[PDB]
């Protein structure tokens, strides 16, 4: 066909507009080059880029057939001989997630302003969740180089306006992630296992103070581990099982793992805690990988020491490479989720680093930060919508 024509239908959605418009076009020389349609709050837009003979493009018959059929039923229709108009839009360069409880218009306006300031175009906005948190997504086209500046703006917006705001590369490659590791304490699991253990010794006070200092980047993680575990010296090893039984998963943890299994993720945990507690849950949760420290035991009693290599800050990164090597997943397809400075190296080595209700030391280095006590908000940052979770869960 000689030339291109653009036909744009808009108005209040009605049954059968799509079919009707393409019957009409078939009565002319028409081949489709591109078609985009959506209905947002009963507003229909139907954009049809079309290929027909110069004979048909500049004759009133085509226009009149379309104009009569569309207007008859209560819609509007445009018909312009394009020729120089793009055929198919280009993909977004990035996607921006906004989670809040709530998201104020002010918060969202600040995001939109920071975006529009940097020359970043908004290609689509959709809601990804109404529960447990309101989640919104902006697919954007970021001018080359503004990548860095935009993340900073949105980090300022995030904290000023009390929403989480994460900017992810929306490329083919960086999207097909396949491996996720969770920190255990205060990430996959509520609270600190060492504090639960330290309680059985009447040491929960000192132990929680040191844990706070260690997780904030105030103290070396190795020394802090040795000082806190030392408070357990003399407890029967029976206490490991008991503390194990007290563990409460992070809200949405189960939803998070189930959903990630549906997507084919390899899943593991990497903690400075204790393999003898973590392994029960690792099994229950059908996890693929567990790296953890080890309590020393003598005649069935704890000594106050841990064994062998201490999984320290650097050791958490090392474990994620082990995992991603054993799993044949390139580091750029890996996800790490943590809450403490214990985790800075893990997150930084991972393709996507997610700080989860995390001390300032980790937020400052993370790729994205989540502020709400639901681990399944991790899913939203992995391109999953609430409705998709609910639909797949319903099927079962």
What distance in Å separates the CA atoms of residue 48 and residue 85, rounded to the nearest whole number?
12
Contacts (CB under 6 A) with ligand KVU, residues 150-209: 183, 185-186, 192-194
Least gap, CB of 391 to Cl ion (angstroms): 40
Residue nearer to a copy of itself on the CB measure, 102 or 205: 102
CB atoms within 10 A of CB 61: 11
Least gap, CB of 116 to a copy of itself (angstroms): 5
Least gap, CB of 388 to a copy of itself (angstroms): 5
Told to check if 388 binds a copy of itself by CB under 8 A, we report: yes
251 CB-near residues (< 8 Å, 6+ apart): 132, 373, 374, 375, 376
Told to check if 226 binds a copy of itself by CB under 8 A, we report: no
By the 8 A CB rule, do 104 and 28 touch? no
**Alpha-carbon distances, residue 102 vs 117, 118, 125, 216, 287 (angstroms):** 24, 26, 17, 27, 33
Catalytic residue of the set 169, 185, 339, 343? 185
Binding mask 145-184 for Cl ion (x = CB under 5 A): ----------------------------------------
By the 8 A CB rule, do 373 and 251 touch? yes
Catalytic residue of the set 164, 169, 183, 288? 183
By the 8 A CB rule, do 89 and 74 touch? no
Residue nearer to Mg ion on the CB measure, 79 or 336: 336
Single out the segment in contact with a copy of itself by CB under 8 A; choices: 84-92, 149-157, 180-188, 361-369.
Answer: 84-92
Contacts (CB under 8 A) with a copy of itself, residues 340-379: none
Residue nearer to ligand KVU on the CB measure, 340 or 351: 340
Told to check if 214 binds ligand KVU by CB under 6 A, we report: yes
**Alpha-carbon distances, residue 272 vs 267, 290, 384 (angstroms):** 17, 11, 29
**Alpha-carbon distances, residue 147 vs 143, 184, 382, 394 (angstroms):** 8, 31, 19, 38
**Which helix or strand (DSSP H or E) is residue 46 part of?**
strand 43-52
By the 8 A CB rule, do 261 and 267 touch? yes
What distance in Å separates the CA atoms of residue 385 and residue 108, rounded to the nearest whole number?
19
Told to check if 84 binds a copy of itself by CB under 8 A, we report: no
Told to check if 281 binds ligand KVU by CB under 6 A, we report: no
Please identify which residue in 161, 339, 345, 376 interacts with Mg ion, judged by CB under 5 A. Answer: 339
Pick from a copy of itself, ligand KVU, Mg ion, none: which does 193 bind, CB < 5 to 8 A by kind? ligand KVU
What distance in Å separates the CA atoms of residue 356 and residue 338, rounded to the nearest whole number?
6
Pick from ligand KVU, Cl ion, Mg ion, none: which does 268 bind, CB < 5 to 8 A by kind? none
Pick from a copy of itself, Cl ion, ligand KVU, none: which does 51 bind, CB < 5 to 8 A by kind? a copy of itself
User: What does the DSSP assignment read for 280-337?
Assistant: HHHHHTT-SEEEEE-EEEETTEEEEEE-SS---HHHHHHHHHHHHHHTT--GGGEEEE
Told to check if 254 binds Cl ion by CB under 5 A, we report: no
Please identify which residue in 87, 209, 286, 307 interacts with a copy of itself, judged by CB under 8 A. Answer: 87
Buried b (16+ CB within 10 A) or exposed e, 97-121: bbbbbebeeebbebbbebbeebebe
Known catalytic residue at 185: yes
Q: Give the footprint of ligand KVU on this chain (CB under 6 A).
A: 183, 185-186, 192-194, 211, 214-215, 221, 225, 272-273, 339-340, 342
Contact positions vs Cl ion (CB under 5 A):
274-276, 294-295
Residues classed as catalytic: 183, 185
Which residues here bind Mg ion, judged by CB under 5 A?
A: 183, 185-186, 339-340
């Amino acid at each position: 066909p000689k030339v291109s024509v653009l036909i744009t239908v808009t108005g209040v959605d009605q049954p059968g507009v799509t079919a009707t418009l393409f019957e009409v076009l078939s009565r002319h020389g028409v081949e489709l080059l591109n078609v985009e349609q959506v209905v947002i709050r009963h507003r229909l837009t139907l954009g049809v880029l079309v290929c027909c003979p110069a004979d048909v493009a500049d004759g009133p018959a085509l226009r009149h057939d379309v104009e009569a059929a569309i207007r008859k039923v209560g819609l509007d229709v445009s018909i312009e001989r394009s020729d120089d108009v793009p055929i198919i839009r280009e993909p977004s360069t990035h996607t921006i997630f906004v989670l809040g409880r709530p998201i104020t218009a002010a918060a969202f306006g600040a995001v939109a302003r920071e975006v529009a300031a940097l020359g970043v175009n908004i290609d689509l906005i959709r809601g990804v969740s109404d529960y447990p948190v309101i989640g919104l997504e902006l697919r954007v086209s970021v001018p080359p180089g503004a990548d860095e500046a935009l993340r900073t703006a949105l980090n300022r917006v995030s904290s000023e306006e009390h929403v989480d705001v994460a900017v992810e590369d929306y490329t083919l490659e960086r999207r097909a992630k396949r491996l996720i590791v969770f920190d255990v304490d205060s990430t996959l699991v509520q609270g600190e296992v060492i504090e639960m253990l330290a309680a059985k010794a009447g040491a929960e006070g000192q132990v929680a103070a040191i844990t706070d200092a260690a997780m904030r980047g105030e103290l070396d993680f190795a020394q802090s581990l040795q000082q806190r575990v030392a408070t357990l010296a003399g407890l029967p090893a029976t206490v490991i099982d008991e503390v194990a039984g007290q563990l409460e998963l992070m809200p949405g943890a189960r939803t998070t793992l189930r959903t990630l299994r549906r997507l084919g993720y390899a899943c593991g945990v990497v903690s400075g805690g204790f393999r003898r507690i973590i392994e029960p849950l690792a099994e229950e949760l059908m996890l693929d990988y567990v790296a953890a420290n080890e309590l020393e035991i003598v005649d069935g009693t704890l000594t106050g020491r841990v064994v062998g290599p201490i999984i320290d800050r650097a050791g958490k990164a090392t474990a994620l490479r082990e995992f991603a090597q054993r799993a044949g997943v390139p580091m750029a397809q890996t996800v790490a989720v943590g809450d403490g400075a214990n985790d800075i190296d893990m997150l930084a080595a991972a393709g996507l680093g997610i700080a989860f209700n995390a001390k300032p030391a980790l937020r400052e280095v993370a790729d994205a930060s989540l502020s709400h006590p639901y681990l399944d908000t991790v899913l939203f940052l992995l391109g999953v919508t609430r409705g998709e979770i609910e639909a797949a869960d319903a099927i079962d």
